[PDB]
Amino acid sequence: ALQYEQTLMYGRYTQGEDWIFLVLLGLLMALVSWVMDYAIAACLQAQQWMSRGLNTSILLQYLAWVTYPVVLITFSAGFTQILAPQAVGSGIPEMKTILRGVVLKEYLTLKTFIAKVIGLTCALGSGMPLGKEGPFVHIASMCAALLSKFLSENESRNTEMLAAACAVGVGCCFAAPIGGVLFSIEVTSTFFAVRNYWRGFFAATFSAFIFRVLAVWNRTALFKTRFRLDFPFDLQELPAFAVIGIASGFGGALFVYLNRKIVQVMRKQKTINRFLMRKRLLFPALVTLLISTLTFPPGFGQFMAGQLSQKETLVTLFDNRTWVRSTSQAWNPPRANVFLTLVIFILMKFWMSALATTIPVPCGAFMPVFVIGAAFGRLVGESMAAWFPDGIHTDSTYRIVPGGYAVVGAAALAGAVTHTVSTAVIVFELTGQIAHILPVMIAVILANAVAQSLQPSLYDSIIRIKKLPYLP
Amino acid sequence: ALQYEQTLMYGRYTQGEDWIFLVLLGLLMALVSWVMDYAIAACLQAQQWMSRGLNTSILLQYLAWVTYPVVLITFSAGFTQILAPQAVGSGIPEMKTILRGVVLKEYLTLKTFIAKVIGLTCALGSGMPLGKEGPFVHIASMCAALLSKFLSENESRNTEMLAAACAVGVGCCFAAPIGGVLFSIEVTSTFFAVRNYWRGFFAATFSAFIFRVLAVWNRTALFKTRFRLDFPFDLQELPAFAVIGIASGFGGALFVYLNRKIVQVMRKQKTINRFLMRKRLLFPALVTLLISTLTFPPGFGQFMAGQLSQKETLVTLFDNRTWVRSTSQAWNPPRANVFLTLVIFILMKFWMSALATTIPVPCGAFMPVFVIGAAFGRLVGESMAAWFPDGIHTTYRIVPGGYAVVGAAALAGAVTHTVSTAVIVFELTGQIAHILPVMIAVILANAVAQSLQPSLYDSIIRIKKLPYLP
Ligand SMILES: [Cl-]
Ligand SMILES: [Cl-]
């Protein structure tokens, strides 16, 4: 068996009843997922309230803007450090190792569950560039471990039990039942049984039903698009969706390389590392103060749409309107233009997300890279709509739709970081439409073919950083 | 290697180079699939040209109606026995056996390819209730085998090339690039590498690109629906979509049992089996004459929409209109109503498809059971829309064509033991608005069917005496 060792970032490792189980697994992870999302929304509304409540100086608005996220990230790192140090980072590298028959000593205990749920809520409620896909795979796996201990060779049934929980975790994260099952298979395994695809599809369907009940009866796609079904794209637009796929493959390989290079450079410093490992809370507080200072809207933040939340940013990039011809006018500052505001957002969010993904809190990385791909897809789509203002064809009614290039760019960059093709299925379930299926599949295959030639996936790069037993 | 043996019905058996390959495999199966769909549409247009001319009397109309399909099926059966007897039936049971490392003597040869392509074109050019999912899995596997011999660790590379070919064949059959990859994995394997799911998705994307070019050079979704995006179904309707799944579970198990029972009765009836074996073409001709006599429109065919083609039938069932308040007209003859015509269609097409899939021709079974499920779904949707005329909530109305999409996916899932018929139904219709109803019905249909019977493809492995593992 292996046991956890702390360092400043990720740390290291050292040294019938089945229907009942899958229905109760689907019920628990939907209730736990709904409670976490309610508490994250309440934290983001409190930042808006304390900001909106005052106008006396730009200095008081600045101190309110930077203090709130630094306090939430300091509490997240410190509370996680006291209860369960093994709860920092994403959960996918460890669950991939546990399903391979390796034992990690205290990874699925009740203290680790309490450290994940409280630590993830404070990390996401700050507004830092953080995701939740990996943390949800570990929280679902702890629901399964505790539920199978309650519902009292069984090691094979344990592996069978944890694999269905990994499928439920991703499905609850995106509200995407089929794409979540298929993505969990691509990231947690190398060969997978058709039986465990059926057990995953069964449990994800019951969670989708509990979300549909909670969403209407006691108060659907998360980012609903409204594109036309008649001629959404021309045959002559296909070369541009192929450029998005190739450029996403080079960008997704660069992201994984940058995230590893940030970890390797601080492990090599003598005095800096030996100081910060005594001053444990100083590194997460300094990174949060840097990022929060640059997103401050009255200063530099207006040139990168810094006033939008992670949800509002993605709701605007997918809109059914052409900008070159909480609202889409955040991309159009008085002293700038749409093209410059997209280019600055892409360059700033790229290094901010690679840095924030390394701090010692519970966090994932999928939505951070998905939103960078959506902005790059808008940059190409608005550029096409500025070059062809009366449409791409001479015949002459149907104009270009830049929001459909954003959907393609989101799926292509996330596929190149994770080394998955099932981001295509996730993007149809997130948007509630399947009209861009050929553009999406072309871009996703080009992004994977380019990225796998350059780098490992994000999750395989983390396994090598943590010194876990590696199957290449 | 196992050797093939003839019988009245199914027969028996007795004792960067990877990118260049996947591009050419995706191209060839798209070109072959296009040439076949063109030839089948030309055969179905010639039946209309005979019918529009021969209006002199009911007798000249009847003789035109039954002679055309009896000639095409008799030629399909006769041509297959002369050239390659092993080409009859599906293709999935046999590829599932070849992927487990068994050798079948001549199954991927050029004479088998010619017999499969010409024989399936003539079988589907008749109005018979036949499919092509299995035949296209065999034709795609013959494209991959003939590619692998044209452009050259000799073992296992071929087994991975045949795994990608199974995915391309199902993807070209439905024009459904993701759902065809996932369905081929469920029906041909128990464990599949993530690396071969990527190889299938790559080759299927290139076939979809070549179809998009061909649809602009000559002339998004095969059965494109047009339902509203705002409240297409209510929370109170989920119990009706669940009853579709449970009823499709028993109906999908009954289809597999009846198909086996017909084959076992003929094998045991030794007095008839010896006589028909001296005269092998008599069996497909008399089944085709029986089916065509009942589908003849001026007779009994009125009461089961017998004047529609298989494509027109599915386009009428999936439309955005409510019939109780061609798309209504063929289902609403002057002597009856739409409910009675849906019930007679379901009960007649059930035994006709179970019988027709046993005859000595290249044929599949997916579109035959998908069309029965679509009608059973329409019956529940039109009954809900008749019971709740102002809508179910105290004021959007019910969409009967959305229940047809659920029933089509659920019955085809229960016959094949698959869940990927959900992904296939979104790619065939070009909408994903019914995803929760579809998944509820498909999971309920699978849990009921797997408790009662094997899959259709596992049942054929047992009938043909092939190597089996439950
Ligand atoms: Cl996320
Ligand atoms: Cl078919």
Residue numbers in the entry:
A (entry chain B): 14 to 28, 88 to 224, 231 to 297, 303 to 408, 419 to 488, 490 to 566
B (entry chain A): 14 to 28, 88 to 224, 231 to 297, 303 to 408, 419 to 487, 491 to 566
What does the paper say about this structure?
CLC-2 is a voltage-gated chloride channel that contributes to electrical excitability and ion homeostasis in many different tissues. The TM region of CLC-2 displays a typical CLC family symmetric homodimeric structure, with each subunit containing an independent Cl− pathway. All eukaryotic CLCs contain a pair of ‘cystathionine β-synthase’ (CBS) domains in their intracellular C-terminal domain (CTD).
Selected two-dimensional class averages showed a clear TM domain embedded in a detergent micelle and features indicating an intracellular domain. In the cryoEM map, clear density for the Egate residue (E205 in CLC-2) reveals it occupying the ‘down’ position, at the Scen Cl−-binding site. Our cryoEM map also reveals a density feature at the Sext site, consistent with a bound Cl− ion. CLC-2 is the first CLC channel homolog to be seen in a closed conformational state. Another new feature of the determined CLC-2 structure is a hairpin density blocking the main Cl− pathway on the intracellular side. We tested several candidate fragments from the CLC-2 N-terminal region and found that the hairpin density fits perfectly with residues corresponding to 14–28. CLC-2 also displays a bifurcated pore, with a secondary pathway to the intracellular side, distinct from the primary pathway common to CLC family members.
